[PDB]
Design a protein around this ligand. Structure first.
Ligand code: NI
Length: 341
């Protein structure tokens, strides 16, 4: 059964609630983004209205074969009416197509559901600036002060500089980047741009990327692995055994691998600066873990909430343990006392 924090009171709506069967009272199912923990349950046999972004609806139709008549894509930054209720979709700064949803309830209550997001000051100048928000359904993934990480721009600077140096020293080095979901495309696109290469990948991953409205994409990606010196592999293959095996398949074209695993946070964040990150090495294989996050750090999350000043916060992540819930509630109260709302 569907948990309360996936239900929008005073509507017939749910958010990211496709794994519970037919939800009683639900007239419209919203999907914030195409990540499996959130779409779990959708397929060609789904026959209720799904509301989402254009990019998300391309993925639903092409990857999961949801029939077109049930996909309701909405433009961003535009007031729309769904089953009698005004809604707006806003960019979540998460993966491609990911949205936050503003609901304007018939009784005057305003609710923001962030989906998954990486808070940014640029959100302080969207349509959120224009009215009060009463209830916030918040992505609390990294809601603890230990979770610090660098800007996405610092991380990509590190990656491009690392790759360009390695391949200029050894033109027979191959670069490999791990992936298992959409998101974090900048990692492999920025490294291929500095090297003058396309990114090579499986037909299944190429298909996924072609749903994303990324500009000039036919110019940056390919299924012809032989023509590319940046390859994408599944995340599970980014280890010494998997990479040794891949290097064998390349037929003596290459004699070294430099590989990147874009994780979110790891405890090497609490001690070490990005500039100071070093790889794990075995023979002619090196593996870099880089802290490229598509979720808010603690400080970014606190700044957003202290700006928005909601009356009530409902966490949507880390809600399964009493210790996690009590921790999060204590920071919410600190934030409110410090800012004065
Ligand atoms: Ni996500």
């Amino acid at each position: 059964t569907c948990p309360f924090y996936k239900k929008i009171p005073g509507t017939g709506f749910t958010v990211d609630a496709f794994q519970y069967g037919v939800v009683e009272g639900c007239t419209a199912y919203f999907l914030t983004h195409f990540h499996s923990d959130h779409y779990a349950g959708l397929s060609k046999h789904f026959t209720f209205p799904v509301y989402c972004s254009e990019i998300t609806g391309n993925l639903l139709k092409n990857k999961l074969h949801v029939q077109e008549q049930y996909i309701h894509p909405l433009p961003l930054d535009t007031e729309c009416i769904v089953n009698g209720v005004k809604v707006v979709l806003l960019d979540a700064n998460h993966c491609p197509g990911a949205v936050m949803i503003l609901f304007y309830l018939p009784n005057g209550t305003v609710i923001l559901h962030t989906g998954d997001f990486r808070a940014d000051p640029s959100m302080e100048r969207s349509l959120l600036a224009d009215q009060k928000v009463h209830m916030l359904y918040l992505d609390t993934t990294y809601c603890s002060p230990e979770y610090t990480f660098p800007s996405q721009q610092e991380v990509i600077r590190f990656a491009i500089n690392t790759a360009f140096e390695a391949v200029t020293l050894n033109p027979h080095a191959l670069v490999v980047c791990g992936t298992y979901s959409i998101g974090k495309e900048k990692v492999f696109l920025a490294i291929a741009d500095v090297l003058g290469s396309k990114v090579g990948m499986s037909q299944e991953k190429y298909k996924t990327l072609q749903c994303l409205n990324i500009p000039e994409i036919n110019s940056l990606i390919t299924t012809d692995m032989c023509s590319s010196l940046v390859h994408l592999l599944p995340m599970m293959q980014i280890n010494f055994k998997g990479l040794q095996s891949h290097l064998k398949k390349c037929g003596g074209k290459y004699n070294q691998i430099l590989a990147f695993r874009p994780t979110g946070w790891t405890h090497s964040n609490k001690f070490t600066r990005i500039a100071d990150v070093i790889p794990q090495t075995k023979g002619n294989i090196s593996i870099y873990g880089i802290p490229y996050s598509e979720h808010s750090s603690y400080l970014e999350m606190k700044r957003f909430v202290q700006w928005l000043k909601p009356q009530k916060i409902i966490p949507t992540v880390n809600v399964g343990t009493w210790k996690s819930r009590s921790t999060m509630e204590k920071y919410f109260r600190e934030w409110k006392l410090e800012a004065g709302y």
